[PDB]
Amino acid sequence: HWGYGKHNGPEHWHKDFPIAKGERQSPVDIDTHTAKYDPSLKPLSVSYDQATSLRILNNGHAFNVEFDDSQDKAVLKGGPLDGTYRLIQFHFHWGSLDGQGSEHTVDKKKYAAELHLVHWNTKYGDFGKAVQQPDGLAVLGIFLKVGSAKPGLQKVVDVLDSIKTKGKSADFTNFDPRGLLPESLDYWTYPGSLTTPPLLECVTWIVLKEPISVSSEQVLKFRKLNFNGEGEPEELMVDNWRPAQPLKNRQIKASFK
Ligand SMILES: CCc1c(F)c(F)c(S(N)(=O)=O)c(F)c1F
Ligand SMILES: OC[C@H]1O[C@@H](O)[C@H](O)[C@@H](O)[C@@H]1O
Ligand SMILES: [Zn+2]
Predict the structure, then answer these.
(1) From ligand 2's centre to the CA of 133, what distance in Å?
(2) 65: CB partners within 8 A, 6+ apart
(3) Are 140 and 152 in contact (CB under 8 A)?
(4) Do residues 83 and 135 lie in contact, with contact meaning Cβ atoms separated by under 8 Å?
């Protein structure tokens, strides 16, 4: 099955998932000079006060923090979005070293990691139907740099020892994703895809300009996770990022002048 290694990684995905070579693949490099301020973007609304986290899962590619999306609690709206998008999960991509790990790049700069908060468009009823639509998903992407610790991340860090290997999960209730946001909501936006197989072209990407800082100790604990299952030879879960893909017939819009 697909992964991030030499024999199953991003350069192989197109064989099982030919959309990998499609017209609106993600991630992309964000050329800050070419991105254009868009006055038609409405204010972005990140409304996470009633979020209900449930569980954290090592899926063999990353770890997902899952939310109760059975009703409108944690939602994203405004900006480029038409209607209401409900938070279903978040996860990260990260590197083996601090100089790589992000999926999006900014003027070709790679960050140490990238957080993805995944939301589905409520007009389609469920996530599965949403991923059959060109506007089914909105992913809020947040870069991580290594510096001061992010206090709101520590609860995630401290549970990772209990989900070291593929297929392990743990209760993860009462986690507040507001503690993972930077101060500014300035963002870039463009139409793209899932960055993992099945690579479906359903996503409105909203990538925040301001990174969050996490400590070296925090990201080092991400790097102790395993891609493999329990009892199998250890393959550290590192470098679980897809590189930038061709922009093709797309423009990146900026929320800020
Ligand atoms: C199918 C579940 C799923 C992912 F596994 C995933 F990695 C992403 S991503 N990296 O594009 O944010 C999604 F948006 C997503 F919906
Ligand atoms: O034709 C002019 C238009 O070209 C488009 O490619 C740009 O996105 C618009 O901002 C611009 O007004
Ligand atoms: Zn992701």
Answers:
(1) 25
(2) 53, 55, 56, 89, 90, 91, 156, 172, 175, 177
(3) no
(4) no
Residue 51 three-state SS: coil
* Type and span of the H or E element at 222: helix 216-222
Task: For residue 206, report the distance from its CA to the centre of ligand 2, in Å.
Answer: 20
In the structure encoding, which two tokens stand for residue 111, read together? 């960050």
Q: How far apart are CA 148 and CA 218, in angstroms?
A: 10
Residue to substitute in 66, 196, 241 for testing ligand 1 pocket (most ligand atoms within 8 angstroms of CB): 196
Contacts of residue 40, defined as CB under 8 A and 6 or more positions apart, other chains included, come to: none
For ligand 2, is residue 251 a contact (CB within 6 Å)?
A: yes
Question: What distance in Å separates the CA atoms of residue 27 and residue 176, rounded to the nearest whole number?
Answer: 26
Tell whether residue 104 is among the known ligand binding residues: no
In this structure, the residue with its CA closest to atom 6 of ligand 2 is 251
The residues, any chain, with a CB within 8 Å of residue 171's CB and separated by 6 or more, are 54, 55
Strands 203-208, 63-67: pairing kind: unpaired
The helix/strand/coil state of 154 is helix
Ligand 2 in contact with 34 (CB < 6 A)? no
Nearest CA owner, ligand 1 atom 3:
194
In whole angstroms, give the CA distance from residue 101 to residue 238.
Answer: 8
Q: What distance separates the 2 farthest-apart alpha carbons in the chain?
A: 54
Backbone angles phi, psi at 13, to 5 degrees: -60, -30
3 state DSSP class of 109: strand
Beta bridge partners of 92: 115
